[PDB]
Motif scaffolding. Structure first.
Motif, PDB file in Angstrom:
ATOM      1  N   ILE A 212      41.215  22.418  74.783  1.00 48.45           N
ATOM      2  CA  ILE A 212      41.960  22.972  73.616  1.00 48.45           C
ATOM      3  C   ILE A 212      41.689  24.476  73.432  1.00 48.45           C
ATOM      4  CG2 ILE A 212      42.362  20.732  72.613  1.00 48.45           C
ATOM      5  CD1 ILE A 212      39.721  23.130  71.154  1.00 48.45           C
TER       6      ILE A 212
ATOM      7  N   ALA B 182      41.564  28.596  74.734  1.00 45.87           N
ATOM      8  CA  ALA B 182      42.357  29.549  75.544  1.00 45.87           C
ATOM      9  C   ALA B 182      41.966  30.985  75.193  1.00 45.87           C
ATOM     10  CB  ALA B 182      43.817  29.294  75.310  1.00 45.87           C
TER      11      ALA B 182
ATOM     12  N   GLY C 156      61.107  34.515  83.274  1.00 44.79           N
ATOM     13  CA  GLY C 156      59.860  34.346  82.502  1.00 44.79           C
ATOM     14  C   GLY C 156      59.382  32.886  82.411  1.00 44.79           C
ATOM     15  N   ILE C 157      59.918  31.979  83.235  1.00 47.75           N
ATOM     16  CA  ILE C 157      59.703  30.519  83.073  1.00 47.75           C
ATOM     17  C   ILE C 157      59.285  29.978  84.439  1.00 47.75           C
ATOM     18  CG2 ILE C 157      60.675  28.265  82.503  1.00 47.75           C
ATOM     19  CD1 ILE C 157      62.649  29.527  80.625  1.00 47.75           C
TER      20      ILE C 157
ATOM     21  N   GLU D 212      57.257  24.829  84.215  1.00 44.35           N
ATOM     22  CA  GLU D 212      57.756  24.138  82.987  1.00 44.35           C
ATOM     23  C   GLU D 212      58.552  22.871  83.365  1.00 44.35           C
ATOM     24  OE1 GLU D 212      56.679  25.040  80.012  1.00 44.35           O
ATOM     25  OE2 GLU D 212      58.234  24.594  78.492  1.00 44.35           O
TER      26      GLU D 212
ATOM     27  N   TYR E 223      54.269  30.631  69.806  1.00 40.70           N
ATOM     28  CA  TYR E 223      53.202  31.172  70.672  1.00 40.70           C
ATOM     29  C   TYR E 223      52.257  30.024  71.040  1.00 40.70           C
ATOM     30  CZ  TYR E 223      49.392  34.045  72.346  1.00 40.70           C
ATOM     31  OH  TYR E 223      48.430  34.585  73.153  1.00 40.70           O
ATOM     32  N   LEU E 224      51.644  30.121  72.222  1.00 34.40           N
ATOM     33  CA  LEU E 224      50.667  29.137  72.763  1.00 34.40           C
ATOM     34  C   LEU E 224      49.608  28.811  71.710  1.00 34.40           C
ATOM     35  CD1 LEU E 224      49.838  27.568  75.278  1.00 34.40           C
ATOM     36  CD2 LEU E 224      48.405  29.528  75.904  1.00 34.40           C
ATOM     37  N   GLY E 225      49.305  29.745  70.808  1.00 38.24           N
ATOM     38  CA  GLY E 225      48.418  29.514  69.651  1.00 38.24           C
ATOM     39  C   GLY E 225      48.742  28.222  68.894  1.00 38.24           C
ATOM     40  N   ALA E 226      49.983  27.725  68.965  1.00 38.53           N
ATOM     41  CA  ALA E 226      50.411  26.438  68.345  1.00 38.53           C
ATOM     42  C   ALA E 226      49.600  25.261  68.906  1.00 38.53           C
ATOM     43  CB  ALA E 226      51.890  26.196  68.566  1.00 38.53           C
ATOM     44  N   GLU E 227      49.390  25.268  70.227  1.00 40.45           N
ATOM     45  CA  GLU E 227      48.885  24.145  71.062  1.00 40.45           C
ATOM     46  C   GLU E 227      47.375  24.299  71.326  1.00 40.45           C
ATOM     47  OE1 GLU E 227      51.593  23.417  74.527  1.00 40.45           O
ATOM     48  OE2 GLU E 227      52.726  25.148  73.746  1.00 40.45           O
ATOM     49  N   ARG E 228      46.875  25.535  71.465  1.00 36.92           N
ATOM     50  CA  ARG E 228      45.465  25.860  71.819  1.00 36.92           C
ATOM     51  C   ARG E 228      44.823  26.709  70.717  1.00 36.92           C
ATOM     52  NH1 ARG E 228      46.232  26.373  77.659  1.00 36.92           N
ATOM     53  NH2 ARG E 228      47.798  24.730  77.899  1.00 36.92           N
TER      54      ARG E 228
ATOM     55  N   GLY F 172      48.095  30.251  64.351  1.00 33.59           N
ATOM     56  CA  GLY F 172      48.142  29.037  65.192  1.00 33.59           C
ATOM     57  C   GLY F 172      48.644  27.832  64.401  1.00 33.59           C
TER      58      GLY F 172
ATOM     59  N   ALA G 190      52.288  25.783  64.871  1.00 34.11           N
ATOM     60  CA  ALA G 190      52.273  24.322  65.108  1.00 34.11           C
ATOM     61  C   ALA G 190      53.243  23.668  64.113  1.00 34.11           C
ATOM     62  CB  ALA G 190      50.852  23.806  65.004  1.00 34.11           C
TER      63      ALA G 190
ATOM     64  N   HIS H 142      58.531  27.235  77.101  1.00 38.60           N
ATOM     65  CA  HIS H 142      57.481  28.234  77.418  1.00 38.60           C
ATOM     66  C   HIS H 142      58.147  29.283  78.280  1.00 38.60           C
ATOM     67  CE1 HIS H 142      54.794  24.788  76.383  1.00 38.60           C
ATOM     68  NE2 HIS H 142      54.078  25.764  75.826  1.00 38.60           N
ATOM     69  N   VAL H 143      58.203  30.498  77.747  1.00 42.25           N
ATOM     70  CA  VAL H 143      58.641  31.718  78.478  1.00 42.25           C
ATOM     71  C   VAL H 143      57.434  32.649  78.530  1.00 42.25           C
ATOM     72  CG1 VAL H 143      60.412  33.516  78.662  1.00 42.25           C
ATOM     73  CG2 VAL H 143      60.955  31.317  77.609  1.00 42.25           C
ATOM     74  N   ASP H 144      56.478  32.293  79.388  1.00 36.63           N
ATOM     75  CA  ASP H 144      55.131  32.911  79.473  1.00 36.63           C
ATOM     76  C   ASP H 144      54.700  33.045  80.944  1.00 36.63           C
ATOM     77  OD1 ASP H 144      54.510  30.340  80.285  1.00 36.63           O
ATOM     78  OD2 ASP H 144      52.773  30.140  78.870  1.00 36.63           O
TER      79      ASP H 144
ATOM     80  N   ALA I  54      51.058  18.445  61.840  1.00 38.87           N
ATOM     81  CA  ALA I  54      51.056  19.359  63.012  1.00 38.87           C
ATOM     82  C   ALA I  54      50.125  20.544  62.717  1.00 38.87           C
ATOM     83  CB  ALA I  54      52.464  19.801  63.315  1.00 38.87           C
TER      84      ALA I  54
ATOM     85  N   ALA J 298      46.436  21.299  64.633  1.00 36.93           N
ATOM     86  CA  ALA J 298      46.065  22.672  65.048  1.00 36.93           C
ATOM     87  C   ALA J 298      44.790  23.094  64.311  1.00 36.93           C
ATOM     88  CB  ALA J 298      47.179  23.638  64.752  1.00 36.93           C
TER      89      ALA J 298
ATOM     90  N   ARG K 290      41.791  21.913  66.025  1.00 47.33           N
ATOM     91  CA  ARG K 290      41.461  22.651  67.275  1.00 47.33           C
ATOM     92  C   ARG K 290      40.768  23.974  66.919  1.00 47.33           C
ATOM     93  NH1 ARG K 290      46.479  20.041  68.574  1.00 47.33           N
ATOM     94  NH2 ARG K 290      47.715  21.757  67.712  1.00 47.33           N
ATOM     95  N   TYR K 291      41.287  24.697  65.921  1.00 48.32           N
ATOM     96  CA  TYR K 291      40.787  26.036  65.503  1.00 48.32           C
ATOM     97  C   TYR K 291      39.412  25.870  64.852  1.00 48.32           C
ATOM     98  CZ  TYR K 291      44.781  28.856  66.901  1.00 48.32           C
ATOM     99  OH  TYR K 291      45.735  29.511  67.625  1.00 48.32           O
TER     100      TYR K 291
END
Ligand SMILES: NC(=O)c1ccc[n+]([C@@H]2O[C@H](COP(=O)([O-])OP(=O)(O)OC[C@H]3O[C@@H](n4cnc5c(N)ncnc54)[C@H](O)[C@@H]3O)[C@@H](O)[C@H]2O)c1
Ligand SMILES: NC(=O)c1ccc[n+]([C@@H]2O[C@H](COP(=O)([O-])OP(=O)(O)OC[C@H]3O[C@@H](n4cnc5c(N)ncnc54)[C@H](O)[C@@H]3O)[C@@H](O)[C@H]2O)c1
Ligand SMILES: NC(=O)c1ccc[n+]([C@@H]2O[C@H](COP(=O)([O-])OP(=O)(O)OC[C@H]3O[C@@H](n4cnc5c(N)ncnc54)[C@H](O)[C@@H]3O)[C@@H](O)[C@H]2O)c1
Ligand SMILES: NC(=O)c1ccc[n+]([C@@H]2O[C@H](COP(=O)([O-])OP(=O)(O)OC[C@H]3O[C@@H](n4cnc5c(N)ncnc54)[C@H](O)[C@@H]3O)[C@@H](O)[C@H]2O)c1
Ligand SMILES: Oc1cc(Cl)ccc1Oc1ccc(Cl)cc1Cl
Ligand SMILES: Oc1cc(Cl)ccc1Oc1ccc(Cl)cc1Cl
Ligand SMILES: Oc1cc(Cl)ccc1Oc1ccc(Cl)cc1Cl
Ligand SMILES: Oc1cc(Cl)ccc1Oc1ccc(Cl)cc1Cl
Lengths: 258, 259, 259, 257
Positions: free
Chosen positions: A252, A254, B240-241, B244, C146-151, C160, C164, C246-248, D163, D167, D170-171
């Motif tokens: 989890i 990053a 950019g993908i 996925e 942003y990936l901050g949603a998931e991690r 974050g 989410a 995801h466009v990363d 949701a 998160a 996790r944080y």
């Protein structure tokens, strides 16, 4: 113990380092009766010794590459355990060449087949073979790696094999649930085992995970052991088809190193 | 034609009939200005695929049975003669023995059944990548087709679910391996579509009806919806993908507890 | 003619030429969209009028998504020139600065959590509520995540949580608005230097890290995100709803690459 | 028992059907010393009784809408528990109007604010107020629902709040891990509780889940309790930032004809 009254078959005990060794110690601590498989004759004696220190003389061959060997395992086990309460699948293999270098350069059709056959198919192969011996309330458990979910250097085709195995957990939980059997996996963080040594730069993965894991240490076979004991007990009667991360929360996190 | 794939040369596998997802992709890519080449599995499919190819302005039609390393090597030996370089390929190939797709998963799964599902549906994507890696231009894209069976336990889909999980992990490992040399690798997780191979899934017609009822867009996806999505993912628009799995299932995958 | 010909799309979040929404605007105009623009407050009005004029639009209206009345006035003014349209891009995010520097538990506050969630997540549905009756069949809504949603990313902190919530918003809006013919998606964009991005601690190190470890081995651009966004608000993406794309460059699918 | 020597604070006991009730029972059985919170005076008697059945006379008020109420909880708790080994956050609220009808029609700024404030923010609010009271080896646990991952009819804005909660987990796991604190969630299958009534067609959700869940039954506060006891015990030492599904495997199932 919370496994008082349970009879669990444990695969994959190769040494005191093995995840499966940790699991056995925790399950014995919690009152399980245990039985043990060994891959080949080379490994028999050590597994018998480990078995005997946990009060068990049920030690039987199983090369999961061979359907006959899986049938023979349960043919022989039925004589002492007509019925039991599930098993721990703690078994992986791929040819050594698969685990060093660019995934696409190094992967082969045969490397792919072996990795999936031994690491993924073997889990449901064992389930087919003992299905009628499992008591209501039974639990099956396998061991997976974040390699299933992410692209990890050098883990390579074992990533595909674990992804297959984690889907197997789901299809097996769904099929065997009605008749009272749960199926789960632990996604374990890096631990120093003979098999770990087969991955190029394992020690780098181990060091990296120690640094950036939220609990700031690598997990032990004790930590996995306790989690596995819980997942095979009636304490976890509400959980099936689950991949439980026992990696200290590494999955989890990053951008912790820049 | 001229469009967002003008300048691209894309190889298309898995056209069997006009229902095929690869047909919809072939249609959509031609409409956006791509030069196309086609593979056929066996002599049974050769003639059908040749007429489809000619209708889309291609006479590059080449045999490929992805069970066979020789067949994949010979594909790209022949392809090199007309296309020394090209900009990637569409992997639209699945197979398991019929007995795998009807009944309780544990009861009907077999070692050979598992072996063949994973070999044809998963290994064959990276097999094709290994054998054409040097021919791929910078900006190339590889695409495969997965299904929600990779993520969820679906009745009767059985061992294809595992082979699709393996496929989606292959997308990630290939993306990671090939990204640095300028190759993108993605998947479409398509919703159910009546294809020749779909008729082989026990109860398919109920999946289709279930998905129509509960999918947010309240309809089955088309090979046109999947074709437009594939065309985008193989184009420089999608630069950019990489790595996925894009769900093209009308959002069925995010629905729960409907009706 | 481009694949957005005949579409009328409203664009929020243009602050500068570096803004994600400006890259979206450029790509969508390139593909034949007619555009309308919002601006947060009086200080940004002139620059947004100029950027809109450069893309053939003088439909340029105030919207502070903090205010229900502002969102209502936006759609009451828009309707006079666009009785109907085909969706909007939500490129809006905000938390107080003090929330994005330090240990998440030390630094998060009730008000900071409220504002982040209110401006970054709730605003997407507030806008959809306010224009639901104006959307044509085939309309598409887009937000930026942003990936901050998931991690758990250091210092992104309560943003974050807000992301989410936002991605959950995508799914609940897709599911609610799907039957009336409206699609709702997010782009989960890799890091890009934009005005807002300079409010994230060590953003320069974040860029360099993603640069090194992303499969495609570069930062994504507002061009990359704009192209994907054009696709996701066009009829080419008619099969896709409730999806976080995801466009990363594949960053999210890589682990242990630094070594 | 495997919580022997642990001190756990439990929130959200309302009645005997409460998930937090199942958790208290399971944690008592495994030898934890418990403390309990109550939202308001109306619940205080029920909880003082439930606490005494388990051998606790630590029963304190906490309304998580109020920062002062959270500070005061930990000021009073410190007097009897200067240190302790974590807490169970079993607390959710949204205005009733939020949970009946089409999500976009029914959602409001204030509906969204309260759902997120009570259901998600309150978890880290409690962690903030007690951070220096936590022993090495402490575990925090919260309760989530698949509404976080899937669009579920009528669950509406609670889905977004869960949701945000997941998160949050996790944080909080990332921030508190290095000082020796774990943070996890259980994503519980549907269970008839006082709160569950608030969801339109809850009955149908129960029967749906019962019919298609692999274990082919509704999960119990004792199943969730056993999982909660595990996750707050040293047995779960290698698990942090994890949302554990205790829903019989419902989440992995699709297309059950
Ligand atoms: N870092 C780690 O140690 C780690 C991390 C997560 C996952 N895992 C998984 O945990 C499991 C246990 O591995 P370990 O790390 O404890 O290594 P180990 O080498 O101690 O044990 C691996 C076991 O696999 C068995 N095995 C291999 N091929 C077999 C076959 N054909 N028939 C029967 N048994 C066979 C070996 O005999 C051995 O007992 C594996 O599935 C592994 O992939 C390991
Ligand atoms: N139709 C759906 O609902 C659906 C949904 C999700 C994903 N998919 C995937 O889409 C892809 C295409 O299937 P489809 O639905 O278009 O059906 P289809 O029958 O038209 O396509 C299947 C194709 O696989 C090819 N194939 C099988 N074995 C092969 C081999 N050994 N060598 C070469 N080609 C081989 C066949 O020739 C055929 O062209 C598959 O990966 C399938 O699993 C289908
Ligand atoms: N690395 C990145 O830049 C990145 C990556 C992932 C996601 N995002 C997301 O992209 C979106 C756009 O951000 P950006 O990077 O282009 O930054 P930016 O500064 O260019 O855009 C931020 C915009 O938010 C608007 N905004 C803030 N509060 C508002 C309010 N109350 N009412 C109306 N508008 C308001 C501002 O006017 C501005 O136009 C945000 O939602 C952000 O979280 C950014
Ligand atoms: N019941 C289910 O099916 C289910 C499934 C998944 C998750 N959950 C979650 O489990 C948790 C407990 O709910 P439950 O099902 O046991 O219902 P319940 O009604 O028994 O418990 C809800 C509790 O929330 C407390 N609460 C509400 N607002 C509060 C506030 N401002 N301050 C302090 N306490 C407050 C109430 O006092 C009550 O004890 C919630 O977070 C709920 O969302 C429930
Ligand atoms: O999967 C693993 C993951 C890690 Cl981090 C460490 C060891 C692992 O186990 C294996 C790795 C490679 C092979 Cl060939 C076989 C096995 Cl059992
Ligand atoms: O993967 C699929 C998923 C669906 Cl819903 C429908 C068809 C699919 O494609 C196949 C299914 C079974 C076999 Cl044997 C071969 C293929 Cl190509
Ligand atoms: O969400 C973002 C993520 C990244 Cl990596 C960069 C910029 C982002 O955008 C923001 C960051 C902070 C604030 Cl206060 C507001 C916004 Cl719009
Ligand atoms: O989260 C829940 C999920 C389910 Cl299936 C059932 C009950 C739940 O809990 C709540 C539902 C609505 C409100 Cl207002 C408050 C709470 Cl605690």
């Amino acid at each position: 113990g919370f496994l008082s009254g349970k009879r669990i078959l444990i695969t994959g005990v190769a040494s005191k380092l093995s995840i499966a060794y940790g699991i056995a110690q925790a399950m014995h601590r919690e009152g399980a009766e245990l039985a043990f498989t060994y891959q080949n004759e080379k490994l028999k004696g050590r597994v018998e010794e480990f078995a005997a220190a946990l009060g068990s003389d049920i030690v039987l061959p199983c090369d999961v590459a061979e359907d006959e060997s899986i049938t023979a395992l349960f043919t022989e086990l039925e004589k002492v355990w007509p019925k039991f309460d599930g098993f721990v699948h703690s078994i992986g293999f791929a040819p050594a060449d698969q685990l060093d270098g660019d995934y696409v350069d190094v992967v082969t059709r045969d490397g792919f087949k072996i990795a999936h056959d031994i690491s993924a198919y073997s889990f449901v192969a064992m389930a087919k073979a003992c299905r009628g011996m499992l008591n209501p309330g039974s639990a099956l458990l396998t061991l997976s790696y974040l390699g299933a979910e992410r692209a990890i250097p050098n883990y390579n085709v074992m990533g595909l094999a674990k992804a297959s195995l984690e889907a197997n957990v789901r299809y097996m939980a769904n099929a065997m649930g009605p008749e009272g059997v749960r199926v789960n996996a632990i996604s374990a963080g890096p631990i120093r085992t003979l098999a770990a040594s087969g991955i190029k730069d394992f020690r780098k993965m181990l060091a990296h995970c120690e640094a950036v894991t939220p609990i700031r240490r690598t997990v032990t076979i004790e930590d996995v052991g306790n989690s596995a004991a819980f997942l095979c007990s009636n304490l976890s009667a509400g959980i099936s088809g689950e991949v439980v991360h026992v990696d200290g929360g590494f999955n989890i996190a990053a951008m912790n190193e820049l």
